[PDB]
Structure formats: C-alpha cells, structure tokens
Design a protein around this ligand. Sequence first.
Ligand SMILES: CCCCCCC(=O)CCCCCC/C=C/C[C@@H](O)[C@H](O)[C@](CO)(NCc1c(COP(=O)(O)O)cnc(C)c1O)C(=O)O
Lengths: 423, 492, 143, 49
Amino acid sequence: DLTVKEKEELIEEWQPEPLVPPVPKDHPALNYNIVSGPPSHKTVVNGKECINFASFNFLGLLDNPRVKAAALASLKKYGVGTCGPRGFYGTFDVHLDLEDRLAKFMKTEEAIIYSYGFATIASAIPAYSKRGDIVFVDRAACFAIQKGLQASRSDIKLFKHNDMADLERLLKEQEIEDQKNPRKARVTRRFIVVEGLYMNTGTICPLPELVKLKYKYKARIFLEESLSFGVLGEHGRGVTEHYGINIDDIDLISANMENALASIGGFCCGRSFVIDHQRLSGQGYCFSASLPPLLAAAAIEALNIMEENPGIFAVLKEKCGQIHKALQGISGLKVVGESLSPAFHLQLEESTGSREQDVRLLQEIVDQCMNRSIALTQARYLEKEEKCLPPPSIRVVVTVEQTEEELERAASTIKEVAQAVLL
Amino acid sequence: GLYKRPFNEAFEETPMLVAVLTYVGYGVLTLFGYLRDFLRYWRIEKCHHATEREEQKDFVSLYQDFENFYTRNLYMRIRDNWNRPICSVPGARVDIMERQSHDYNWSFKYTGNIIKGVINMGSYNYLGFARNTGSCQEAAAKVLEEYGAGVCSTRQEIGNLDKHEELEELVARFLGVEAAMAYGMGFATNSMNIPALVGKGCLILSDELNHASLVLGARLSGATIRIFKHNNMQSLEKLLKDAIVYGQPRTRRPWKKILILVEGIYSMEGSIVRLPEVIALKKKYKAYLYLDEAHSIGALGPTGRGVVEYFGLDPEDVDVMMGTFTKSFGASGGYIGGKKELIDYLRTHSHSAVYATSLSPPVVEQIITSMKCIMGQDGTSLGKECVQQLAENTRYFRRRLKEMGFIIYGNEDSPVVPLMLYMPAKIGAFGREMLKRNIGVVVVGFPATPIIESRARFCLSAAHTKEILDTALKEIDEVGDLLQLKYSRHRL
Amino acid sequence: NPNTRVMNSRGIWLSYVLAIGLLHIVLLSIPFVSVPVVWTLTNLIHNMGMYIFLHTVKGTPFETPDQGKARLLTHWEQMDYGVQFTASRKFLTITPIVLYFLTSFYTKYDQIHFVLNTVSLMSVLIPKLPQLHGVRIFGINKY
Amino acid sequence: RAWKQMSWFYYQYLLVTALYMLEPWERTVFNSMLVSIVGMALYTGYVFM
Ligand SMILES: CCCCCCC(=O)CCCCCC/C=C/C[C@@H](O)[C@H](O)[C@](CO)(NCc1c(COP(=O)(O)O)cnc(C)c1O)C(=O)O
C-alpha cells in the first residue's frame, strides 16, 4: 500500500472546485421584481401601478374581507406558530375541521393536509411507489411530479403529451414483458400519473380514455389538479366533475391550496385505504411543522365562500373564453392552451437559433407592456434540471375581478406592443 | 480545536438486564402479532383495516403486508399517545381535547370534556414567543389587514414582495453573515437547496443521526453519500483521509467537492456538535461545511445568535448556515445564510425560488418582530431575560433529574432533555400515566430511535416558571417510583 | 436500516443463549420424553427456527426509507450490509456447530439420531457460506 | 395489606413482559401457557427426587 509520505503529498496537492460556480451570464432571473403592497388586482410593480395579469389568484379570494376577518379571528385565538409536528401536540382543531371540510367538498372519504405546496405531491408520490415498480408519467408533468418520481427509485417511462395511443403501446409492451416472467409480474405495481390541467402547456387530459385503460391494463391512477381544483366543473370540484367521471375511479387526487384558495399548503384526498398510509410514510407530513392555524382558517372560509356562490366558476369560464378569443390573431405570437384554461402561454412562432435571445425578446415585450400598466410575467424554468424543457413563453392568467374592458385593453396593448417589437 | 469552556456530556450504557428484558418484550409482541395476522388471514376475526374496493381485487396488492407488520401490531396498540389534538395557544399550559376509543385505538370519538391546564413539555417555543397577545401579535394583525393572508405566485415571477426583502436583510444582520435568503418550510429548505450545491461526482459526509430532510436532500442530488459515527472526530478524520487519498469509487479520479452535513443540536440525542474540531478538520482537508441550526438558533448562546456564538467562533468560517424559524421565533419558515456569491447563486438556481410559493406576509412580520425583540432593538429588556431564564431553567431541570436517578442524555447545556425508558410497553405506560397526572410529554420509537433506546423528550422553555418545574419534577419523581425507571448506576 | 444493526446491539448474544437454554429446559419439562430424544428435539427445533427466521422470511417488518433495497433479501444477506465476515456472523455460524457437538455427546453416538442431526446441521449450515449469497435453489422463494 | 404489594408486583410483571399492551384474552392465553409450563416442570422435577 501507499507510504505515509505519499499520503501527505496526495492530501496536500488536492485542490477542490469552488462551492458555487460564477454567474457571468447576466442572468435575468437575478433581477427580481419588487412588488409594493399586496399582489392583488391593481398592484404596483417596480414602482409602477399595473393591472395584475400574472398572479395565480383565480377567484380573487386573496383580498376578500370575509377571509381576512376569519384569519384575524384565528390569529387572535391561537397565535402565529404551531410549535410542533402533526404528531407531537401540533394538531389543532382547525386542522381536523379543515380536513373534514375538504373531504365533504370533494365527496370523498378522507383528506390529508400538507404545509407546503411542493411537498404534498413530492412526498405523496414516493410513499406508494418503491424500487422495481413501473410508473407511466406524462411528458409535460410539472417539476414537483418529476422530483417526486426521482425520489422513488422506481422505473419511469415517459409518454408523449396527451397521446393515448402511445400510452396504450407502452402498456402493451409492459404486458409482453410480464408474459416473459410471471413471477416478477406478480409483485410489480403499475401507476399512471397525470395532471388535471397542465401548468407548462395549459391543456386538459382525456380522463375517460384513461379510466378505460386503467380498468383494462390494471394500473392505478394518480391525479394532480393544482390548477383545476377550483376552476373546472359546474361546482368547481376539479376535472372529474367536468368530465363526469365518478370520483371513486381515481385513487388519489392531489392539489395545492395556494392558487385558488389563496393560502399556503396542499392536500391529498381519496379513499381511507390509500390516505391513511401517508400519515406515517409521508416525509413531508411526519417530519415537518404543521400549517399555522391562521392559514387553515383562511382556507376554511374560502371553502365556505366557494360552496355558497357557485356562479363564480361560470363568470371565470366566460372571461377565459373571451380573452382566449381576443388574443388570437397576433402578428408573431402563438397562443398555447384551451379555451377553458385560466392560465395559458404565448410563445414565438418563428424561433431564432438560441434560447437566450428568445428570452430577451420576450422580456422586451413584457417590459414594454408593463410600461403601459398591464403587468405580465414570463414562465421560469431550470434549464439543467428539467426533464423536458418547454419553450420560453409569456404567461397569461385570468381572474374574476378583471372586468371586460380590462381584458379588451390588455389584448389591444399586447397586440400593438408585439407587432412593434417583433417587426 | 480549542474549547474555551469545558465540554461535558454523558451517554450512559444500557444495563444488561434492561436490554435482555427489552428483547423479551419485543419478541412476545412479535409472536402475538404473527398470531393475530394468522387469525385475520382465515377470516376468523374481521379486520377493522380498510379493504380494497371490490372491482380492484384483480390489481396487484397496493401494500406488502409484511411492510405494515410493525404498524399493525406494535404501533396501533399505543396510538393514543400521539396525535393529541389541542385547542389553545401552545404556551406553558395547553388545553387538550379529550378522546376515547372503543375498538382498541382503531377509531377515536371525542367526548365533550376538554382537559384544561395541562403543563406543556411537548411544544418547542424555547424563548416563549408563542402567545396570543403582545406587540408581535399586533404587528402581525396589522400586516394581515394590509397585505392579506398568503401570496399567489413564486418568488422569481411576481411573488417577491418588499416584506421578503426586509426579512432577508434583517436575517443577514442578525447572523453576522453577508447575505441570507428565506424559504417557506425548513424541510423544503434542506431538500431543495442541497441538490443545487453538490451534484454527481461529489462526496457528502453525513452524520449518523442526521435529520430526515438532510438525508432526502443528499439522495435527491447524485452525490455519493458516506456516513460517519455520531460526533466521532477520529471517524470523520479517517473518512476524510481515505476519501482524498483513494478518490472516486469506480474510476479513481479526484473528487470535485467534499461537503460535510452537521447539525447544531441533535433533537433526539440532545448532544451539541463538536464545532471547533470540525472547523479545524475542514480547514486542514479543504472541505465545505453545511451547518443545520434548526434546534439551536435561539436557545444556545449568551445573546442567542446560535451555536457559533456558544463556542465563540467566527461565522465566516461556516460555508452554509441553515436554520429554521419554527423552533424558537414562533413562526414557520426557514433560511440559509452565507457569503454574497453563494446567495446570488441560490437565488438563481434554487428549486424553491423557481417552483414554490413565497412565504406568507403575516408570518414574515411575526418573524421580523421576534428577531427585533431578540436583537435588543425593541427598546425593552425582554429579549435578554428570555435567554437568561432559559439557561437557568435548563440548568435546574437537568441537575434535578440527574439527582433523582434517571438516565439523561446530551450535553449539560442542551435545552432538549431526553429521558430513557428502554422498554416497549413502558412507552405507552409513561405517556398515559403522565397525562393522567396533568403533564403532557412526548415519547418516541422506531421511526426516530433504535430498538434498545426508546425515549421521552422534554423541551424546556423560558415560559416555564419555577413553580411549574417544581410540580412537574415531583410528578416525574412519583411516576418513576411507580414504573421503576431509575436505571442510573452512578448517582441515585 | 435498523434491522441491519439489531444483531450488533447490546445483550443480543446473551439473549440468544438464554433463549436456547430456556427452550432446552422446557423440552426437559415434558415427563415421558427420554433424554437423548430431548436433546435431538432441542437441536432440530433450534435449527428449524434459525432457518425460518434467517433464510426464509425476507423483507423488513418496518417500512424503510431507501425504497426497498432489502425487498428481495433475507435477514442473513441483510446483516451488516452484505459484509461477509463479522463478529455477529462468525458467532451465528459457530453456535449451531457447538450445539450439534453437545447433542451428539448427550445422545451416546447412535446412528439414528446422528443421521437426523447431521441433516439438520447441514441444512442450517449450507446457506451460511459466502459463496451461496443471493441464490435460490430451483428458484424457490426467489420472489 | 399484602394485597397492595401483590397488585404492584403484578403491575410490574405486566410492564416487563409486554402484557400491558395486549387485549384481555391475549393475557389469558399467555398466563395459561406459562402456568402450564411451570406445573409440568415442577411435577417432572419432583417425581424423580
Ligand atoms: C413499540 C411501539 C413504538 C411506537 C413508536 C412510533 C412513533 O414514534 C411514531 C411517531 C409519530 C410522529 C413522529 C414525528 C417525528 C419528528 C422528528 C423531529 O426530529 C422533527 O423532524 C423536528 C420537528 O418537526 N424537526 C424540525 C427540523 C426541521 C424541520 O423543521 P420545520 O420546517 O419547521 O418543520 C429540519 N431540520 C431539523 C434538524 C429539524 O430539527 C424536531 O427536530 O423536533
């Protein structure tokens, strides 16, 4: 073996890399946007007053006085901090009441509450899937699903976006691979992970065909409805209410309450058999502090407002349709999404060679729009970590408080600005 | 490695008879669990556990049965100790909703009674900032009225506010580092910022008893993971020498980076990390340090800056300074502090900054007010009496427990006090007897501890007066007399 | 994975020895059974129990956070993360040989007991070989 | 009188042998097996002496 002197020389000559590499790229994400005051409709950004077309606040429950009053009462009763996990004196009565309300709202047996929107799905996925299992996940799943899948060392087989024939082909090949070795097929579990309303592309998954495929090839369905929880359906119950699928056919429904309910946290609802397991095997649940009672009361009052008045979904639908129909016709931009989608994307038709120049062009459009008092944002991704990187795009988000004239003026402003820049 | 104040800790060995009886109890429980499983298999006894909906019987079973064995037989029998609902502010005294079960802990029904006045040894609140009155609550109420509850978008797009900037600057001043950043949840902080730093081709030296979040963060990134013994500096030095000399496993190439994950205070064992020796080793072997100060940000130190103040070291030595606001400051959230370049890179490349919602406004205002109170800027002496009272409380409580004869782990300064039970049934017995005598405690088992050492955790606080500690100590003494828990051989 | 370290803990060896001694005493308690048959039954029961609990039952009673590394591995392969030779493994391999020697001593060296005892010792001993790791004969108990 | 001491001793027995957690019929099964074993051991020991 090595002499001691050689060991000293080898230890002495080693020189490691810097902890973080230098960032010389003039990275636009380094320049954050500074919002003064609440991020509500008619906000102020970078010192300019603007109409808000960027924040995921579909029902406009962020500044509803009843929600604020409920949160204030909870603050005056409990305080701010929870001071423990859900297991160790951290469970309050508001937590149980909120779980009950969510379960009764989704017409489901049991629901579970997570204190962070990412952690809910990123810890639900690896709870049920272990090494050796097979997961068929859509290509354009959001980042949280990707990290959850990476957490569980199972096998991942991507399939083309909303291509059901492609999932059918993958499932047939898996059936052949089971035919070869029955012993392993007796132990291998099959999952299908899909999103109710995709964030990256703003399209909606074909649920009936998914249910038929599940009952034919025996694969359990996981549904993520981060965007469609409070916007789709007549009663706003998700995509299952929109398509008419019975809620039992879906094994697990996960959604974060940050977008529609306008409060921090996420939740997962389903039959008691599947839900009871996360309370012990969910890493985001066992080893983290519970949600503060303030936000729980805010969510409860949001649910009461949602259940009392169900016409807000109808007005949201009509506004989404109107803006989608108005934005069609731009000179050099294409609209990506379906009519019924609250948040969609505007992308370039003719793409220059590099991606960073496309980002700079989009930022030019965004700035010249914001100088006309319409606040828009651009979709942000991690280029190195994303499994399937979507093209750069400007995000357009529709909200109930925006009037009709504001939608018309936003469309005209965007059209004139883009025709000035691209040309 | 210079220790300017003496470093005392004690980890007494388990007596032989106690270990043997522990194994006997565990074996009996396992055998009766097997018998119960066999009885349930032939449908002799109907299973309370939920079953598959009928037309999904052909699918491969969702759970392997053997995986839930421990949950089905060991855990379910004493489930009433955990998940106790509370209906008041988790101060020194908490109000618990009383519940009962008729099917041996499978289902729980809440009776009308509320158990009022329970002494609260479970909730952290080290500095006693968990109250429903005061200046912190008024400031939080004002910001709640002005800003609303929650924000609706990620930090990079529109979710960055002026409150977050004020909080980041204030934390930067508080710790002493050049820059800092704040995140929604501490678990998220670890599991979303470890992958950004180290990638495939780097080595992560992790403590044996590290929190689950740090392990998850290490696994998410592709870095190789090796584990050293808990506070064994010789083991750490051996690992560092071997790693530098031999190199990457398959192809013996030099490592890109070597990162050391340590914690300020280990919650279960209650021991403080040997920081001066760790820093000396880091300097000698050119590694990087990631210090998780979740349990020691407020409790430890003459002015509560953290463990680095406790040892009188220099904060610029630690490369990454993580921390959590939940334990001490009384609000949820996490933070990472360090040099300016590191924080710029994190703001650009962190998963949480890109794909996760910002921190709530009332919460950040509560954090700002609590931090301003600790830093002596409020104008009152209330940020000093908290630390002094916490130190005296920990001293008195630990000394009195040691005089009576229990086995107590950890450093003599650590506020978290683990007491040893060592037997499976004694866990539930201790929990039920303690709550019966009007003190609430927390006990732990396999998902957090090894087999022999099953312990009960006390989290001291500045809110506890002397009379509360006196009554609690007398009741612990009587229970220890009752359950025969005084195992210590030296002093009794 | 705590299951790996349970055989390395304090007092496990003495507990095992006391368990074997108690088993032999309870076998002695039966009135009509003669002494060599008592020893033979002790040896056979100990070997069968050791075989069942080491080489047949696979997996972990508790859920594990490494996403099921030990899903297909029995306890013996699970011990010490696959390290072939250690103090615990040496002791576990040593003890049945001592038990068989003692049993053949107190059974007066007859053939009828010898054949059964040798078969039992071989059955418990063959899986211990480092060469026989991660293999199932005729593909039984593979999954 | 002696009843309190015996009650404490039985409590300790349940605590040590993990019979505390078990349902009432499981305790009956375990106690019956244990006393049967002790009885057979005593009889086989004494008949010879
Ligand atoms: C024989 C029968 C035995 C049955 C026993 C079964 C059993 O014990 C079940 C236990 C139920 C609940 C378990 C809770 C586990 C808690 C672990 C604890 O260390 C936590 O992780 C804490 C508090 O949550 N961690 C805080 C913390 C974080 C995260 O903080 P937040 O983001 O604010 O939530 C991150 N890093 C670090 C280092 C800590 O400590 C804790 O330490 O108490």
